[PDB]
Amino acid sequence: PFLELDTNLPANRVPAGLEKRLCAAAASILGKPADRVNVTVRPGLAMALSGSTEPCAQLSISSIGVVGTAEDNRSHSAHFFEFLTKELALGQDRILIRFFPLESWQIGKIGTVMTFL
Amino acid sequence: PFLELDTNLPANRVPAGLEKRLCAAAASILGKPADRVNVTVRPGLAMALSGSTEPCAQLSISSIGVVGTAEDNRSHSAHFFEFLTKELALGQDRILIRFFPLESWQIGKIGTVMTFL
Amino acid sequence: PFLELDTNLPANRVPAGLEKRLCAAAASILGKPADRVNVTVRPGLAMALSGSTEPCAQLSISSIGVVGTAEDNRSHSAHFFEFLTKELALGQDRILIRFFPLESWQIGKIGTVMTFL
């Protein structure tokens, strides 16, 4: 899975090791191994969420198979909100998530695509 | 709606308050309330647009229902180009926009997804 | 085409001119002119790839027509991996690529969309 997190918290207010802890958290939530989790954190951005520039975070989750239905994503969302509110010290009103299904032909790995691996 | 703006203008050349003014502008253009507009600005990046590293900006707009047809997006594009050329002091050759339709099952909000709200 | 590269290499470890060389490389690989190539590089990020925070890079490629099949993307992937491993001095285990087809109605250019140009 691919997780991308944008935040207007400065880099020195994002807890050290967050990108590693989000790999473990995603592994348990999504049912994929931690060594197949990719995390990108982009701090220090200028953001408005719901029209307000108070501290906030946007998460994007992309994966094959597991983020493609309302029922699956409801479960995922509840667990990611619990993790992120506690780690970033944000309220639930200051986080949004977007889910994007991928297919094997879209993922380039080791000079090929996943369709052939 | 979700607006993401990447630019190679340094942070100290992006006008103060842009993320707030882009919420108001998007509200009028897209016909959604400003308190449902989310803006992310990422300045200071290394960019080429049309093969040239002169100052430029890329905007991504994602929303339910309103960015899914050529005719709607033609209107949207004209209004966003007018706003951004004036705010960033860029020519129309130095801005591109991408539009992405979303569905309710893809948006995680308050620990659930929008399908159930 | 649109290329976006996220990396945890600091800005002062990304080779000068990379965004320009990636335009030329993409032109040859994708068969589109260099003056229609758009590159965004975001360095200095916090990243884990395959669960590891060692230096890494994520590339996203979006285009009309040419990134929509496994067979096309296998070829593209091999050539992008050769370019990026040499430029960034990374091993092939430290790069992933995502491919995203676009349609003409999604691209805002000169105040309209590409459907009408």
From Swiss-Prot, chains A, B, C:
The modification N6-acetyllysine is found at residue 32. It catalyses: D-dopachrome + H(+) = 5,6-dihydroxyindole + CO2. It comes from the Eukaryota. One of its GO terms (cellular component) is cytoplasm. SUPFAM superfamilies: Tautomerase/MIF. The keyword Glycosyltransferase does not apply. PROSITE patterns: MIF (PS01158). It holds the Pfam family MIF. Changing residue 1 to A: Loss of enzyme activity. The modification N-acetylproline is found at residue 1. GO terms for biological process: melanin biosynthetic process; negative regulation of macrophage chemotaxis; positive regulation of ERK1 and ERK2 cascade; positive regulation of inflammatory response; positive regulation of tumor necrosis factor production. GO terms for molecular function: cytokine receptor binding; D-dopachrome decarboxylase activity; dopachrome isomerase activity; phenylpyruvate tautomerase activity. It is found in: Cytoplasm. InterPro entries: Macrophage_inhib_fac, Macrophage_inhib_fac_CS, Tautomerase/MIF_sf. Keywords: Acetylation, Cytoplasm, Lyase, Melanin biosynthesis. Highly expressed in the liver and at lower levels in the heart, lung and pancreas. Its EC number is 4.1.1.84. Belongs to the MIF family. Tautomerization of D-dopachrome with decarboxylation to give 5,6-dihydroxyindole (DHI). Homotrimer. PANTHER family: D-DOPACHROME DECARBOXYLASE (PTHR11954:SF22). This is D-dopachrome decarboxylase. It comes from Homo sapiens (Human).
